Amino acid sequence: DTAAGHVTTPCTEILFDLTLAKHYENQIQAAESALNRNYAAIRSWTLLEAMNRQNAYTGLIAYGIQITVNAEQELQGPKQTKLRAAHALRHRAANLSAALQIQAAQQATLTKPTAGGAQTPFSGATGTCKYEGITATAGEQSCKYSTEDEEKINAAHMNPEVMTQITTIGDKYLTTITLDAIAGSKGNPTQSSATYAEQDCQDGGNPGPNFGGANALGLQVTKLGTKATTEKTNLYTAGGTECEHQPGNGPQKTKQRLAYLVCEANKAAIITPTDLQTLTLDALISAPEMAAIGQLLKKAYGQTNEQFQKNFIKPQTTVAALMSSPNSGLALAYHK
Amino acid sequence: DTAAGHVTTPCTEILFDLTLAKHYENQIQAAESALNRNYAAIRSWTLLEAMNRQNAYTGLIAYGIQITVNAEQELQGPKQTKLRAAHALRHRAANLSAALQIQAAQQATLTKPTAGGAQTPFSGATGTCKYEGITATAGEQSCKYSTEDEEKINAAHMNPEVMTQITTIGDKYLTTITLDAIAGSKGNPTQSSATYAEQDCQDGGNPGPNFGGANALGLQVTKLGTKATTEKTNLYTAGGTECEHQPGNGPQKTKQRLAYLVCEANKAAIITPTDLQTLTLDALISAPEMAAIGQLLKKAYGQTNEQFQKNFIKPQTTVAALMSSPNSGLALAYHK
Numbered sequence: 001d002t003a004a005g006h007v008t009t010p011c012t013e014i015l016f017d018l019t020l021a022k023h024y025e026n027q028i029q030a031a032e033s034a035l036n037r038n039y040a041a042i043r044s045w046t047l048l049e050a051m052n053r054q055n056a057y058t059g060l061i062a063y064g065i066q067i068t069v070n071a072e073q074e075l076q077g078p079k080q081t082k083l084r085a086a087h088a089l090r091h092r093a094a095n096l097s098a099a100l101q102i103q104a105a106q107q108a109t110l111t112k113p114t115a116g117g118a119q120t121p122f123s124g125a126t127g128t129c130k131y132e133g134i135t136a137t138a139g140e141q142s143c144k145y146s147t148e149d150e151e152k153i154n155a156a157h158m159n160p161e162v163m164t165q166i167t168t169i170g171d172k173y174l175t176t177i178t179l180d181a182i183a184g185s186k187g188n189p190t191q192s193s194a195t196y197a198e199q200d201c202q203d204g205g206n207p208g209p210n211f212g213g214a215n216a217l218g219l220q221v222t223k224l225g226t227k228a229t230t231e232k233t234n235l236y237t238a239g240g241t242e243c244e245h246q247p248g249n250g251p252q253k254t255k256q257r258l259a260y261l262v263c264e265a266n267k268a269a270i271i272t273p274t275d276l277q278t279l280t281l282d283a284l285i286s287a288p289e290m291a292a293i294g295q296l297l298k299k300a301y302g303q304t305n306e307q308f309q310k311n312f313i314k315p316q317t318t319v320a321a322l323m324s325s326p327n328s329g330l331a332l333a334y335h336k
Numbered sequence: 337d338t339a340a341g342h343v344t345t346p347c348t349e350i351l352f353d354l355t356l357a358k359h360y361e362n363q364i365q366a367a368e369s370a371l372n373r374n375y376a377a378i379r380s381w382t383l384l385e386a387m388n389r390q391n392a393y394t395g396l397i398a399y400g401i402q403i404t405v406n407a408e409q410e411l412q413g414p415k416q417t418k419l420r421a422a423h424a425l426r427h428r429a430a431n432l433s434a435a436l437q438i439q440a441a442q443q444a445t446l447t448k449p450t451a452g453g454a455q456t457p458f459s460g461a462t463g464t465c466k467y468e469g470i471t472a473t474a475g476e477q478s479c480k481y482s483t484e485d486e487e488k489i490n491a492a493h494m495n496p497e498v499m500t501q502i503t504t505i506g507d508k509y510l511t512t513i514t515l516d517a518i519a520g521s522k523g524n525p526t527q528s529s530a531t532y533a534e535q536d537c538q539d540g541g542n543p544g545p546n547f548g549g550a551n552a553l554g555l556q557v558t559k560l561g562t563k564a565t566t567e568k569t570n571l572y573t574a575g576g577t578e579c580e581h582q583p584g585n586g587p588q589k590t591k592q593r594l595a596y597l598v599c600e601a602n603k604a605a606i607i608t609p610t611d612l613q614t615l616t617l618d619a620l621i622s623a624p625e626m627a628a629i630g631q632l633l634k635k636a637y638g639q640t641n642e643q644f645q646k647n648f649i650k651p652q653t654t655v656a657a658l659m660s661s662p663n664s665g666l667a668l669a670y671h672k
């Protein structure tokens with residue numbers, strides 16, 4: 001758990017969450033790229049069949065259609081499982097970034113108070129100093145990662161075999177405002193302490209800084225901000241086979257839902273089919289589907305790969321760009 | 337601007353943002369569904385050609401390859417533009433939901449204070465009452481929409497022709513903590529006012545509720561929470577043709593970036609190709625690509641649609657399920 005072991009702060013959880021989402025997204029993108037390459041190969045061989053050789057080209061088209069349509073169908077499930085996780089991880093990272101900005105508002109700006117006597121919620125006070133609209137805001141926050149952060153929290157460290165837990169920021173960071181506050185009194189503050197120059201309530205003597213007047217009353221919000229904590233959540237049950245935190249068994253925390261989805265995404269294996277455009281002879285001969293489609297296989301495609309390449313892989317003004325161009329169909333219709 | 341005119345609260349902005357994202361996502365899903373239907377048709381006709389008729393089936397394959405590969409290529413740009421907007425709108429909705437939860441923390445829980453005399457930041461006070469770790473939290477928040485909310489804020493009201501502005505919650509809701517606070521004093525509170533039963537600082541007489549003791553000093557955070565406001569941002573320039581809020585011209589607010597992306601997504605038109613599985617004769621005859629691929633067209637496909645359907649659309653044990661099954665390639669190899 002190199003990557004998750006490096007999550008110790010809101011910023012580094014954000015980086016883990018975004019980096020794992022993109023990892024799942026790249027896995028799907030890679031598989032879909034492989035499919036489109038295979039469909040471009042089939043279109044390429046379709047034009048060549050239109051130009052013994054015909055049956056051989058059709059053996060490739062049939063083999064290509066079979067394994068590519070199979071893998072496209074086999075992909076949809078793992079695709080959805082992985083995407084559900086990538087969406088939730090990006091959603092969580094968005095959440096954490098928003099809470100980060102708010103928890104950065106740690107300095108308060110006081111308003112002009114208003115002095116009074118007894119009033120809610122100090123019915124027994126002889127003096128009160130009431131503030132409305134005290135605010136706290138921070139400049140735009142940004143996470144700045146070190147070189148090691150991005151080396152540790154990296155798709156290279158997110159293979160399923162090495163992942164057993166996630167680390168998340170505790171919920172209080174996303175739900176709770178925390179602050180320190182202090183009241184100060186001097187003399188006999190009342191409703192007549194209506195000199196507000198120092199953003200407190202003063203009267204008597206010479207009002208001024210540091211409770212200069214005879215009677216003073218005020219407060220300050222000296223600090224705001226909720227401390228982040230971290231929490232570990234395992235992906236698998238004790239035995240290590242099943243995903244923990246299955247939904248449908250009672251209320252769950254965010255970390256539990258995320259851990260379930262990441263576990264299922266890690267287990268959703270993608271079957272990548274053979275790359276048709278770099279296919280070798282021994283790959284086609286050894287392919288089990290080519291038994292039903294077809295020593296005889298060699299007779300038709302070649303007994304050396306150097307031959308199979310030259311006849312079926314290397315071609316020719318281009319077969320591949322044409323059959324994925326605005327003139328793909330006209331090219332096949334003319335030659336047919 | 338029926339949908340955006342209905343955004344008046346954080347919850348309804350969230351609904352607009354999520355509803356417009358899904359609209360863009362459905363537009364892409366629809367186009368990709370149309371493509372896969374067309375590729376399944378081409379695979380279907382490929383098997384039938386393997387079973388004059390051959391040239392006619394090949395005319396459909398060529399026409400199908402041409403218009404489907406064209407539309408797949410034409411889709412990639414509008415796809416990326418729309419997805420960039422759907423991602424940012426979902427990211428914004430996540431943001432707003434997190435701020436909503438925090439701005440819902442409007443009731444403070446006071447801590448046991450500590451009494452003192454003069455101390456930072458009241459060096460001139462004779463009495464202070466210091467609180468640490470005052471917190472405010474709310475139960476889990478949820479947006480509950482009315483029937484009209486979902487009728488007004490609806491993909492049916494998000495056609496580009498009717499959209500000219502977006503409405504967003506102002507930034508203070510996502511960045512600023514706001515609170516009211518009041519101090520109360522009675523008598524001569526000092527460092528000896530160390531009776532904290534009422535979560536204030538009391539001594540003298542009979543300390544107790546409502547400043548029962550002779551000397552008292554305390555504060556309360558009576559309310560927290562930042563009021564949401566709304567802001568309008570237009571999508572287009574004054575002339576109405578160009579997208580406003582182009583990036584690269586200086587710092588921008590979130591509403592401006594969103595408005596730019598929504599404008600570009602609204603303008604990114606998707607060219608949907610002809611549905612091959614429901615193709616009519618007059619559609620194929622009138623298709624301009626069929627001129628180069630091909631009165632002669634009718635001779636081969638039929639002079640009535642009822643004929644074109646029976647020969648080329650309606651087929652047969654199924655041609656379509658087979659050519660998208662694990663046995664698609666074996667089906668073509670055997671018949672070829």
Ligand SMILES: *[C@@H]1O[C@H](CO)[C@@H](O[C@@H]2O[C@H](CO)[C@@H](O[C@@H]3O[C@H](CO[C@H]4O[C@H](CO)[C@@H](O)[C@H](O)[C@@H]4O)[C@@H](O)[C@H](O[C@H]4O[C@H](CO)[C@@H](O)[C@H](O)[C@@H]4O)[C@@H]3O)[C@H](O)[C@H]2NC(C)=O)[C@H](O)[C@H]1NC(C)=O
Nearest residue numbers: 097098100101140141142143424427428431586587588590
């Ligand atoms: C959802 O909510 C989150 C959290 O609030 C928002 O996240 C913030 O998004 C903004 C906008 O992208 C981020 O601001 C950007 O930060 C980039 C990094 O800046 C730092 O590092 C560079 C060096 O690489 C320093 O130069 C810089 O001073 C910072 O230290 C900047 O590169 C971006 O700059 C561009 O835009 C600004 C506009 O203010 C211009 O002034 C610049 O010239 C430049 O054009 C920008 O500043 C911010 O960091 C994010 N915060 C966090 C905590 O992640 C999401 O945007 C929001 N999403 C939506 C869609 O609502």
Ligand SMILES: *[C@@H]1O[C@H](CO)[C@@H](O[C@@H]2O[C@H](CO)[C@@H](O[C@@H]3O[C@H](CO[C@H]4O[C@H](CO)[C@@H](O)[C@H](O)[C@@H]4O)[C@@H](O)[C@H](O[C@H]4O[C@H](CO)[C@@H](O)[C@H](O)[C@@H]4O)[C@@H]3O)[C@H](O)[C@H]2NC(C)=O)[C@H](O)[C@H]1NC(C)=O
Nearest residue numbers: 088091092095250251252254433434436437476477478479
């Ligand atoms: C990013 O940050 C946001 C904002 O904080 C989080 O959004 C919250 O997400 C949770 C979890 O999905 C939401 O809670 C859910 O609300 C659903 C709607 O509940 C209301 O309406 C139903 C009737 O339809 C009432 O019965 C109910 O009382 C509410 O009035 C509930 O259906 C969900 O319930 C399920 O889970 C809970 C767990 O607490 C169980 O108790 C239930 O029995 C049930 O199994 C759930 O309560 C919450 O509303 C969202 N808040 C907002 C403001 O949107 C994101 O989750 C977070 N994302 C990530 C990935 O981190």
